[PDB]
Short mmCIF file of C-alpha atoms and ligand atoms in Angstrom, two decimals:
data_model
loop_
_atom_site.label_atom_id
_atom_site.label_comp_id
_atom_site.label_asym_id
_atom_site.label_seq_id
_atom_site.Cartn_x
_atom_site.Cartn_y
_atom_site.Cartn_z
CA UNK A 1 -1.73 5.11 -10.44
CA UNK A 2 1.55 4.83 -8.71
CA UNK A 3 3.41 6.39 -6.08
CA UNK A 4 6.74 5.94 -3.63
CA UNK A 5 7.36 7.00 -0.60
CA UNK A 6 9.36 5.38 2.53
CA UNK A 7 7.51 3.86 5.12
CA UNK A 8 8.29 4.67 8.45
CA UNK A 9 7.24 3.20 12.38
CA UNK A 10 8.07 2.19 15.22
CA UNK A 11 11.04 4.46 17.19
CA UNK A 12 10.84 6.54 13.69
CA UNK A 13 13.13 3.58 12.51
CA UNK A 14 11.63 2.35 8.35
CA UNK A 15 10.54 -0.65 6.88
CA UNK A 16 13.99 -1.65 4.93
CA UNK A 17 14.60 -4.89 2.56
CA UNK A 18 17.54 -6.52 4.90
CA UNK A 19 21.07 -5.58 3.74
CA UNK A 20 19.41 -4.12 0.18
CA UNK A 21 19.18 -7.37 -1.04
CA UNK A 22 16.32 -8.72 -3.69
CA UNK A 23 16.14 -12.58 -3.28
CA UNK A 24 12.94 -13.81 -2.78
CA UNK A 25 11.94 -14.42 0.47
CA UNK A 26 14.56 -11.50 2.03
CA UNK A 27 13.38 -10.58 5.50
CA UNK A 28 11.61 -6.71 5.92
CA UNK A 29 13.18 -5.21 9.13
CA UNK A 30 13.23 -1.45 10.60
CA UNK A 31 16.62 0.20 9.45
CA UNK A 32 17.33 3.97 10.55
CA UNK A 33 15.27 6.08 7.51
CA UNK A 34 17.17 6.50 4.33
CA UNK A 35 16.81 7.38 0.48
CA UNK A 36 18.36 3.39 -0.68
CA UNK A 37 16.02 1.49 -2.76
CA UNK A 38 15.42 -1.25 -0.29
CA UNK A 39 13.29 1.64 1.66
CA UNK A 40 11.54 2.92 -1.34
CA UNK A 41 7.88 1.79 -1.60
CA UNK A 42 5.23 1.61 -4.52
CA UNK A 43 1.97 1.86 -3.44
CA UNK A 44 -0.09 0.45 -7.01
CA UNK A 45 -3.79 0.34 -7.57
CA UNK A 46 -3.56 -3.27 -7.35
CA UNK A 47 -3.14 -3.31 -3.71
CA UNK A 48 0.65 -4.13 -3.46
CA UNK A 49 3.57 -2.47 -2.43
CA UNK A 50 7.15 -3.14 -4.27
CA UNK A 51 10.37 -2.40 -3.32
CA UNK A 52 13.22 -3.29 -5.91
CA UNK A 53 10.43 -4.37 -8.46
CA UNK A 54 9.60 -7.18 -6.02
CA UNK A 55 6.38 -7.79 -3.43
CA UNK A 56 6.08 -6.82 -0.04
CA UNK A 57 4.83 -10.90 1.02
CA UNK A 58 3.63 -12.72 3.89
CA UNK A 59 5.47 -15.35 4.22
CA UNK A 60 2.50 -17.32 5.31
CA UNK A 61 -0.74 -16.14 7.48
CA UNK A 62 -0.46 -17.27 11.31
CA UNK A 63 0.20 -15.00 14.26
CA UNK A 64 4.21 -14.58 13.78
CA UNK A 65 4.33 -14.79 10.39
CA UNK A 66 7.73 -13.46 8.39
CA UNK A 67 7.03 -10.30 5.79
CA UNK A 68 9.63 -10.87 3.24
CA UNK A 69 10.29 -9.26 -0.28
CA UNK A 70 8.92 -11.62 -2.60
CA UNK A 71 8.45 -11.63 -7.03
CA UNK A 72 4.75 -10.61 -7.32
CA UNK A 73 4.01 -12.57 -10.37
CA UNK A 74 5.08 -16.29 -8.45
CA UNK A 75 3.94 -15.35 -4.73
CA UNK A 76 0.62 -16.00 -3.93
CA UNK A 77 -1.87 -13.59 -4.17
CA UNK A 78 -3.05 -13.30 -0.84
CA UNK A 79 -0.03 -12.96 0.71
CA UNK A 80 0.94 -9.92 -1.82
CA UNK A 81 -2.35 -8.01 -0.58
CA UNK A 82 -2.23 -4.76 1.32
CA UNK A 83 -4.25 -2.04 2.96
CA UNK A 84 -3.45 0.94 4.69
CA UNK A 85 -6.33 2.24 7.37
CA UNK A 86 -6.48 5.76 8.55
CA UNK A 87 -5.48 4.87 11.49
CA UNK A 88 -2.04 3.95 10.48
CA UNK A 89 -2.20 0.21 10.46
CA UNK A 90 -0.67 -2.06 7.68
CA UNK A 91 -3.12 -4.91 7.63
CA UNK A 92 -3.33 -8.24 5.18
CA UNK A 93 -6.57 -8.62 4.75
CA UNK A 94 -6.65 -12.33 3.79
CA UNK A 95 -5.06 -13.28 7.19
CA UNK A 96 -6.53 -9.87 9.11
CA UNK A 97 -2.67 -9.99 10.88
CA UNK A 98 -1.12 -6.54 11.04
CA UNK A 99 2.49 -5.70 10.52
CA UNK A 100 4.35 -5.18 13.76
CA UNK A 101 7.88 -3.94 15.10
CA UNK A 102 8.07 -6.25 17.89
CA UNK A 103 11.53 -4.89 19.07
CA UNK A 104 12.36 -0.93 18.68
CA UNK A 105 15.99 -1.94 17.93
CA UNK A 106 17.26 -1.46 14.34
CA UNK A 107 17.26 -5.01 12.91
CA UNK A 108 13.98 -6.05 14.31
CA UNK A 109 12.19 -8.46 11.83
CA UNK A 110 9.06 -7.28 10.99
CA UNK A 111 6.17 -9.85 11.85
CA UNK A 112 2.37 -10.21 11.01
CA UNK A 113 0.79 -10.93 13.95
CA UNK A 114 -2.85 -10.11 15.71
CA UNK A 115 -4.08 -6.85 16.01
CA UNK A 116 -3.74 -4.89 19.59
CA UNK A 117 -4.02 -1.76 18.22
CA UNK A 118 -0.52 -1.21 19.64
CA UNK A 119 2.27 1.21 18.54
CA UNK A 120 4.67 -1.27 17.37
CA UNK A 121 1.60 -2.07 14.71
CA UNK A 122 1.60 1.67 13.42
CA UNK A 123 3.23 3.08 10.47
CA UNK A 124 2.93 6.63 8.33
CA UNK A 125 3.39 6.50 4.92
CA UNK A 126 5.38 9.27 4.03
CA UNK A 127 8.78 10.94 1.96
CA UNK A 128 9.22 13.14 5.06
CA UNK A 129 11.71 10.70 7.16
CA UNK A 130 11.88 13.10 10.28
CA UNK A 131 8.89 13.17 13.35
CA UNK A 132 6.66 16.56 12.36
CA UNK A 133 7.85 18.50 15.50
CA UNK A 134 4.01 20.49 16.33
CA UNK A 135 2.54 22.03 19.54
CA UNK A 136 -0.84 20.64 20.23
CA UNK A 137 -3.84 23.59 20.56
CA UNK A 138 -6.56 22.57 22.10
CA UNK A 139 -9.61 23.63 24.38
CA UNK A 140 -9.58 27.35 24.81
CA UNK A 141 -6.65 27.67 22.77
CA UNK A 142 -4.65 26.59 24.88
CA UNK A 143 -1.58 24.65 24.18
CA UNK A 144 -0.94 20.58 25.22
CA UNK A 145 1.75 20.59 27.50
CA UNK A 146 4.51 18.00 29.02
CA UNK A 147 5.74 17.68 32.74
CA UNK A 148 8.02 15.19 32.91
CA UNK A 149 8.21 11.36 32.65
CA UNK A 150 5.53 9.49 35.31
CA UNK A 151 3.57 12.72 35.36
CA UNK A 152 0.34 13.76 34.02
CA UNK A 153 -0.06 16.35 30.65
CA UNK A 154 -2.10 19.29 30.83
CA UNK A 155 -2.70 22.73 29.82
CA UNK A 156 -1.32 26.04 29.28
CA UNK A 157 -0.98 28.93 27.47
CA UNK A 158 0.85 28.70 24.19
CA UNK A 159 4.39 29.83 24.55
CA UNK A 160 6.69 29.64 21.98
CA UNK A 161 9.70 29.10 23.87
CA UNK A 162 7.82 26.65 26.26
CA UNK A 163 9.96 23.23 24.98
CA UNK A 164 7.02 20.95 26.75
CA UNK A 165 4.54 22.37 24.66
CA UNK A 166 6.61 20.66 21.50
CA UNK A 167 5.66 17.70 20.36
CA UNK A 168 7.46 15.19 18.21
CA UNK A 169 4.72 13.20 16.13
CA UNK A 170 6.71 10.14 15.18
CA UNK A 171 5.80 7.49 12.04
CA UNK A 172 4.51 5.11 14.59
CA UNK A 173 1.77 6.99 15.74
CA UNK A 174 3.23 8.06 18.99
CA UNK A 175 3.28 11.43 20.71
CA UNK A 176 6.54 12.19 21.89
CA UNK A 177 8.43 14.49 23.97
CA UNK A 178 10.46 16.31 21.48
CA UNK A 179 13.13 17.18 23.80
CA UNK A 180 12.71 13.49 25.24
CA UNK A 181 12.21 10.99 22.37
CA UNK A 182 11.99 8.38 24.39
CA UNK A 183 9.26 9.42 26.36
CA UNK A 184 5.35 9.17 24.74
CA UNK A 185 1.73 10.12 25.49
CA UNK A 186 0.54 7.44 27.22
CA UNK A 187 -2.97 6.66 28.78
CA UNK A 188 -3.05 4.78 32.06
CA UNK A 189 -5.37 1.93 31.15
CA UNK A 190 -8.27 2.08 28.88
CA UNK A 191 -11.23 3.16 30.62
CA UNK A 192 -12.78 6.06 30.32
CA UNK A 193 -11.57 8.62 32.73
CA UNK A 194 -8.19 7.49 32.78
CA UNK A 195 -5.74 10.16 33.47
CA UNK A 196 -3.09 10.68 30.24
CA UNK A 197 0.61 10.78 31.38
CA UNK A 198 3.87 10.75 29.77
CA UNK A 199 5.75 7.08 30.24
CA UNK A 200 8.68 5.51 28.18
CA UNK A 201 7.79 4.86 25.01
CA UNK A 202 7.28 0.35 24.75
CA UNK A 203 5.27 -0.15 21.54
CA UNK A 204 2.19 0.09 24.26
CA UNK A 205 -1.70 -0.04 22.98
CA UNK A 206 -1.74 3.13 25.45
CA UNK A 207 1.12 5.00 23.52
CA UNK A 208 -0.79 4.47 19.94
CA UNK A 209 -2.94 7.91 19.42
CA UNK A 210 -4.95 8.90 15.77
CA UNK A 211 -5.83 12.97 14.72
CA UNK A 212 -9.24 12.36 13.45
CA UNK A 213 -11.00 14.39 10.91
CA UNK A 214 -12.89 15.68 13.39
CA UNK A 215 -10.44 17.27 15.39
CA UNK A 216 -9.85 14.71 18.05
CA UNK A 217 -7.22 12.63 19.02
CA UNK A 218 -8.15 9.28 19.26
CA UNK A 219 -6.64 6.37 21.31
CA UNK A 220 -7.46 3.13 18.64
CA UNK A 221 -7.83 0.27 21.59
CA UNK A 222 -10.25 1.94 23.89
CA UNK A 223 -11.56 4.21 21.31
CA UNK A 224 -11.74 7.16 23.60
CA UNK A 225 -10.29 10.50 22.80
CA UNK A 226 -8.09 13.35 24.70
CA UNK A 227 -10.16 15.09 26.73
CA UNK A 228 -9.60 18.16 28.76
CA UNK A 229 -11.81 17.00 32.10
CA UNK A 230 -14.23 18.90 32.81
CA UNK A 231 -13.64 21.42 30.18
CA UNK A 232 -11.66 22.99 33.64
CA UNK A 233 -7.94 24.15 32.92
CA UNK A 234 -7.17 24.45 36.56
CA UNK A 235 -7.55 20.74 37.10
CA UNK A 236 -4.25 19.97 35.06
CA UNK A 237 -5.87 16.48 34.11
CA UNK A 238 -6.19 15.50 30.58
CA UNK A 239 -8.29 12.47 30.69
CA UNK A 240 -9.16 9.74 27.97
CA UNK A 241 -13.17 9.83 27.01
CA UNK A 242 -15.71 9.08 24.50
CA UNK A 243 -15.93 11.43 21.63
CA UNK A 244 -18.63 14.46 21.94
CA UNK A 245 -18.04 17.44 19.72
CA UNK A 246 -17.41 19.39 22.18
CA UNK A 247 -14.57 21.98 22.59
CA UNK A 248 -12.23 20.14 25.08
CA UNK A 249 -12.16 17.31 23.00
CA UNK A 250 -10.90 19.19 19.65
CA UNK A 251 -6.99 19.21 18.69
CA UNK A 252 -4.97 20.93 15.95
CA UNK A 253 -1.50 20.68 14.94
CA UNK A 254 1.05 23.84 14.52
CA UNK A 255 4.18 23.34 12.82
CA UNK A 256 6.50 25.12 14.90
CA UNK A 257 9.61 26.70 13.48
C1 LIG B 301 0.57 -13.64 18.92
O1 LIG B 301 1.96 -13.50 19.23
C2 LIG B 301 2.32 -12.71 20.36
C3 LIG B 301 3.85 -12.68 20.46
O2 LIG B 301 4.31 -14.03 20.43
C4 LIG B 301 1.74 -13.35 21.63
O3 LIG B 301 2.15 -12.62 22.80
C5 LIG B 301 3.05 -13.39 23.63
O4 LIG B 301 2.43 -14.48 24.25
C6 LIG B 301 3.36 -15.27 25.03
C7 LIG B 301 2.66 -16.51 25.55
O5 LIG B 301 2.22 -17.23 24.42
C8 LIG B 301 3.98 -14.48 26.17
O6 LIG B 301 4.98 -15.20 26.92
C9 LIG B 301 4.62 -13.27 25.57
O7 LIG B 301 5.04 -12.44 26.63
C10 LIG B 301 3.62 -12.52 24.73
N1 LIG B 301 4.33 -11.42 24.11
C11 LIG B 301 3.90 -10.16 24.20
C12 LIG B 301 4.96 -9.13 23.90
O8 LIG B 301 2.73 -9.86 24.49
C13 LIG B 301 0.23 -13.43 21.50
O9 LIG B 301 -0.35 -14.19 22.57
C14 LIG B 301 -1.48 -13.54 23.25
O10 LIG B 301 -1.17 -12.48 24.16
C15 LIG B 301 -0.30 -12.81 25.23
C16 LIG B 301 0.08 -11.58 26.04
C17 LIG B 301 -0.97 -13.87 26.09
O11 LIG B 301 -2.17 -13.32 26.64
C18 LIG B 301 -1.27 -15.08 25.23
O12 LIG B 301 -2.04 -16.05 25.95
C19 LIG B 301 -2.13 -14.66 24.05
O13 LIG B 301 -2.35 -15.79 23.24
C20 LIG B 301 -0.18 -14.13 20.19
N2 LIG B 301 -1.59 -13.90 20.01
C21 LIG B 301 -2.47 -14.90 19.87
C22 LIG B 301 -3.92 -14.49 20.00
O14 LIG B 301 -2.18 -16.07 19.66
C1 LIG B 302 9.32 -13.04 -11.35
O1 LIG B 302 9.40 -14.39 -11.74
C2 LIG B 302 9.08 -14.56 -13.13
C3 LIG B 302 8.95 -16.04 -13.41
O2 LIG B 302 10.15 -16.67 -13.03
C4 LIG B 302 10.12 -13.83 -13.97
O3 LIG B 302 9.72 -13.84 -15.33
C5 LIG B 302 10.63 -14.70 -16.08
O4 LIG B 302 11.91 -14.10 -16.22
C6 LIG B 302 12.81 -15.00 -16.82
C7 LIG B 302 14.22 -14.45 -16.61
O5 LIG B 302 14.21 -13.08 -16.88
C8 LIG B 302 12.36 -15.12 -18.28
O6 LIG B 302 13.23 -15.99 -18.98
C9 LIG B 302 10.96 -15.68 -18.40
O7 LIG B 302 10.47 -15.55 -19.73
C10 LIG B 302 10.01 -14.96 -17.44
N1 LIG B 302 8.84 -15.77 -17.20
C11 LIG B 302 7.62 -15.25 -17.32
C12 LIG B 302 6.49 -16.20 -17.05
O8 LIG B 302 7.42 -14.08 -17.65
C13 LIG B 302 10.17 -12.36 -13.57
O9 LIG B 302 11.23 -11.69 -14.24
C14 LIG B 302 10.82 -10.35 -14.63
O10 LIG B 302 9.92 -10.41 -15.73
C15 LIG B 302 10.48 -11.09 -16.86
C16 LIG B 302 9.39 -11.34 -17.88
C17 LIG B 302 11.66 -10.29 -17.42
O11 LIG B 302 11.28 -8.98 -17.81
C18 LIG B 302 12.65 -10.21 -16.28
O12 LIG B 302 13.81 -9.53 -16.67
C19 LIG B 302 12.03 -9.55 -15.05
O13 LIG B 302 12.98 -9.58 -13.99
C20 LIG B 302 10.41 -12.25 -12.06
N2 LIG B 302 10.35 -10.85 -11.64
C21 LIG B 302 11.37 -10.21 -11.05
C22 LIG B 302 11.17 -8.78 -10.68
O14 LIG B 302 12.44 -10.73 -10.76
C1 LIG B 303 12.91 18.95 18.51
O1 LIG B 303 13.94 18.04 18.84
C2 LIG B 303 14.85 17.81 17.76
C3 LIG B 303 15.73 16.63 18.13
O2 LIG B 303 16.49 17.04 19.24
C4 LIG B 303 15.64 19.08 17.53
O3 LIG B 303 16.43 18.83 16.35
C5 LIG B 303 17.84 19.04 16.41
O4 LIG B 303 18.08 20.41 16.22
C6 LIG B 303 19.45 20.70 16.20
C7 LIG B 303 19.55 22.22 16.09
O5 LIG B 303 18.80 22.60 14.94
C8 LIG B 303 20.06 20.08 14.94
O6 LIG B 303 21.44 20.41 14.82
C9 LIG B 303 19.85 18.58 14.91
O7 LIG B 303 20.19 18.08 13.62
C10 LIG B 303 18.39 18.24 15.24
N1 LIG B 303 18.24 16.81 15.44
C11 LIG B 303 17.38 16.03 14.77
C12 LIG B 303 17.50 14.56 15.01
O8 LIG B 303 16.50 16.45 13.98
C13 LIG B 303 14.64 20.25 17.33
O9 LIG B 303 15.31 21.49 17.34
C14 LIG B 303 13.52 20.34 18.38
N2 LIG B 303 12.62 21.49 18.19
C15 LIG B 303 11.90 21.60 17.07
C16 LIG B 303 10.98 22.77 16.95
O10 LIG B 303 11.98 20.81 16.13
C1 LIG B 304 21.99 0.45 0.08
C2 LIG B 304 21.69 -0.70 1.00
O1 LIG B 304 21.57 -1.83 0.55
N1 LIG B 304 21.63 -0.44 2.31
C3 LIG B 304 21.34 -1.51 3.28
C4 LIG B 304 20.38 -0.98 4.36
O2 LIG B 304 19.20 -0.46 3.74
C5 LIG B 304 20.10 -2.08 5.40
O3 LIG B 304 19.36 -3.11 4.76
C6 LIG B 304 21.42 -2.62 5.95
C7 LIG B 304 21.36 -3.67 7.04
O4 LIG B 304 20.65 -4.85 6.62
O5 LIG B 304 22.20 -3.09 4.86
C8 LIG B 304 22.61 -2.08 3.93
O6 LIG B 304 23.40 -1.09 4.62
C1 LIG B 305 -18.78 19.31 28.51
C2 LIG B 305 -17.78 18.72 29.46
O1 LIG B 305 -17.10 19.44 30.19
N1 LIG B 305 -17.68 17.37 29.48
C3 LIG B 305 -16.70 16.75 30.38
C4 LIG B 305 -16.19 15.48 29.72
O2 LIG B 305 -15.59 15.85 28.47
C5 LIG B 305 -15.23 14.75 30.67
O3 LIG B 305 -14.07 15.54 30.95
C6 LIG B 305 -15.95 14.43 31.98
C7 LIG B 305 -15.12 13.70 33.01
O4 LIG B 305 -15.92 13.39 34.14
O5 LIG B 305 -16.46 15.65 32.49
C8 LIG B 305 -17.41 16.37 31.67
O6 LIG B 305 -18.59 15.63 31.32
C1 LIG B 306 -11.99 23.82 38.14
O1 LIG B 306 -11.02 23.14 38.90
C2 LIG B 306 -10.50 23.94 40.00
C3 LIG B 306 -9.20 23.37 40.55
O2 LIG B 306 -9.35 22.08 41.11
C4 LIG B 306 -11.60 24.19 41.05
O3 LIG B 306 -11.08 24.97 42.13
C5 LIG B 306 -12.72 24.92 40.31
O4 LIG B 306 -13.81 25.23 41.14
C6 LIG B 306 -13.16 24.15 39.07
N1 LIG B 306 -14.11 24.92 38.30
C7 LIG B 306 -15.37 24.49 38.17
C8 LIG B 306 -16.31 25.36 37.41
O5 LIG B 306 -15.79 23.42 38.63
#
């Protein structure tokens, strides 16, 4: 009824007990991904998650709130709490305050603070410590496709030489360029019809992306989905819009080699 894994987010950076130490009350910060102990997790049945035999804790339950490493048995309970939604959130659900990466910079000091549904709030679960490097299939399959930063994705036939058409699906729940980590699938505001572009990646609401169940792709804050517009190649616009079903709206993954 247990299991470890690391945990990793934002940048592709992991949640790491600072300098490995096991005081109570010893700040949680990103730290590039490792096998130490201080990034091993515990997920138990009892909704907590231990590192070093100690309690992933909020260190109280306001907007800006401290996550420290805390003994289970003498913190209190509802700051020892945990849940893990499909979407890649970490929430506490006695506060409702999410974790979040409010820096990208190794040594950021991880904070609970109000959900935005933004990248520097997501987080994969995971032993594998590198991005899953994937080309994205889609409508007619056809193959998701970069075009440099400021421009718009789109398109094209699969090609597996074609760099642009590899994607780097980091821990935080960003799409990146896997030639150009720094750059991420990003929609242009949150209404539906919104054209989906590449911009640096900054821990944005419109950089935070979900593969559903269902086959979508799912942008958590506006809840729309990538959609090829129109279900029309030849416009080389892939557009944020509500879910249908239908075939330009349906996504899988291929591990490339
Ligand atoms: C929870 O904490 C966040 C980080 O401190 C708040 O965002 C910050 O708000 C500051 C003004 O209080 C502003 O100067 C900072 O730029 C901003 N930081 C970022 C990176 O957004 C947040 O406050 C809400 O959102 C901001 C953008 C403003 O609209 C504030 O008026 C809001 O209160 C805090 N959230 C809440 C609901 O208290
Ligand atoms: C969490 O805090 C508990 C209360 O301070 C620790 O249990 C206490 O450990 C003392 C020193 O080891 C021991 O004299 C006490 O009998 C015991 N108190 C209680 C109420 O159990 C606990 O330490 C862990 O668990 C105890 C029982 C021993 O097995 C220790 O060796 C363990 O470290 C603290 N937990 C951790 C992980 O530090
Ligand atoms: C995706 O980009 C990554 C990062 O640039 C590429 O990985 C590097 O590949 C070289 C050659 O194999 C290695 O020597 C490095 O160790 C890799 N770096 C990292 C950080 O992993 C990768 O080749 C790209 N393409 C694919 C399909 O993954
Ligand atoms: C093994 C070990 O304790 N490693 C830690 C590492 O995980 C990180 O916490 C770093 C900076 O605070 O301090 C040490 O290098
Ligand atoms: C079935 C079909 O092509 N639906 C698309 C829809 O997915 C979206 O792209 C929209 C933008 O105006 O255009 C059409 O309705
Ligand atoms: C698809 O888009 C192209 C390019 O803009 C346009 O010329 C074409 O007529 C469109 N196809 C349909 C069926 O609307």
């Amino acid at each position: 009824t247990s299991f470890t894994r690391n945990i990793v987010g934002r940048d592709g950076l992991c949640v790491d007990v600072r300098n490995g130490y096991d005081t109570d009350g010893t700040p949680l910060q990103l730290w590039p991904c490792g096998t130490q102990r201080n990034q091993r997790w515990t997920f138990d049945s009892d909704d907590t998650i231990r590192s070093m035999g100690k309690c992933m804790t909020a260190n109280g339950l306001n907007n800006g709130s401290n996550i420290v490493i805390f003994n289970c048995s003498t913190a209190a309970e509802n700051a020892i709490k945990w849940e893990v939604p499909i979407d890649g959130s970490i929430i506490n659900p006695s506060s409702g305050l999410v974790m979040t990466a409010p820096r990208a910079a190794s040594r950021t000091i991880l904070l609970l603070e109000d959900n935005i549904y933004a990248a520097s709030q997501g987080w994969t679960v995971t032993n594998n410590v590198k991005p899953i490097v994937a080309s994205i299939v889609g409508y007619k399959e056809m193959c998701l496709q970069s075009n440099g930063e400021n421009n718009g994705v789109w398109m094209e036939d699969c090609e597996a030489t074609s760099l642009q058409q590899q994607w780097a699906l980091y821990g935080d729940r960003t799409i990146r360029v896997n030639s150009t980590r720094g750059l991420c699938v990003t929609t242009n505001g949150y209404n539906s019809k919104d054209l989906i572009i590449i911009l640096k990646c900054q821990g944005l609401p419109s950089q935070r992306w979900f593969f559903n169940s269902d086959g979508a792709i799912v942008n958590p804050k506006s809840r729309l989905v990538m959609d090829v517009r129109a279900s029309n190649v030849s416009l080389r616009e892939i557009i944020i819009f509500p879910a249908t079903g239908n075939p330009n709206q349906q996504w899988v993954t291929q591990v490339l080699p």
